[PDB]
Amino acid sequence: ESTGNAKAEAESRAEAARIEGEGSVLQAKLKAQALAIETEAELERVKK
Amino acid sequence: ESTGNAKAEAESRAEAARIEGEGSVLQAKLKAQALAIETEAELERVKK
Amino acid sequence: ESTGNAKAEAESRAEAARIEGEGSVLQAKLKAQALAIETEAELERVKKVREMELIYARAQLEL
Amino acid sequence: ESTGNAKAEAESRAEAARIEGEGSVLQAKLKAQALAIETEAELERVKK
Amino acid sequence: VREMELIYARAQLEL
């Protein structure tokens, strides 16, 4: 009839993984990494 | 009566998705830069 | 009689919205700049370790 | 008949999340971030 | 922290 983690009463809780975006972060789009270093030029300006 | 989410047995499982994951792929800017600025340790030892 | 808000079970829930959230997206300027000015820690350590160029200065000439 | 956090008598209280704007802050509009660095030129003036 | 530029000044010449 029942086995696991039963929880009740009040606000928030979490129990699983739901690493949706996190997994997507690991599988970072190369193009995303490129734009990162390509844009650094602006940061360098704030430095210079 | 108590009711709740059950997770019988053990394999890869997802539940209560989105929020955290989505937020991760969006930025995590604070720790991203934090860890990134701590990377200088390489350049630090090189100087040392 | 007491009456009040009940939150049976447990899942994602919202209530008493707006105010705090709205105020957050608006500015949070004090802590925003506070944490931002504390970010210099990176540039701080960089200086702390760049100090090593002092190498040339070891040629002390205390006559 | 009843379960949870019942509260009464006087002023203010809060119990939930209501992270409306907060969530919106995490999901920061790229264009908003751009204008931020683009406007910094004024701050630099006060520096120079 | 900018004080660190003092590096050059370590070449003390206390004769």
Residue numbers in the entry:
A (entry chain A), B (entry chain B), D (entry chain A): 717 to 764
C (entry chain B): 717 to 779
E (entry chain B): 765 to 779
Give verbatim excerpts from the published study on this entry:
Vaults are large barrel-shaped particles found in the cytoplasm in all mammalian cells, which may function in innate immunity. Ninety-six copies of major vault protein (MVP; 95.8 kDa) form the thin, hollow vault shell with dimensions reported as 725 × 410 × 410 Å3.
Using x-ray diffraction and computer modeling, we have inferred a draft atomic model for the major vault protein, which forms the shell-like enclosure of the vault. The MVP structure in the “crossover zone” reduces the vault symmetry from 48-fold in the waist, barrel, and cap helices (residues 3T–715) to 24-fold in the C-terminal cap disks (residues 716–779). cpMVP model chains A and B become nonequivalent in the crossover zone. The whole-vault model (48 cpMVP dimers) is 675 Å top to bottom, and 417 Å at the widest part of the barrel. In domains 3, 4, and 5 (as currently folded), side chains of Trp 143, Trp 196, and Trp 249 are located on an almost straight vertical line. An amphiphilic crevice that could bind lipid was found at the top of the vault shoulder. The answer may be at the top of the shoulder region. Domain 12 of each cpMVP chain overhangs two copies of domain 11 to tie together groups of three cpMVP molecules (see left panel of Figure 4 and top of shoulder in Figure 5I).
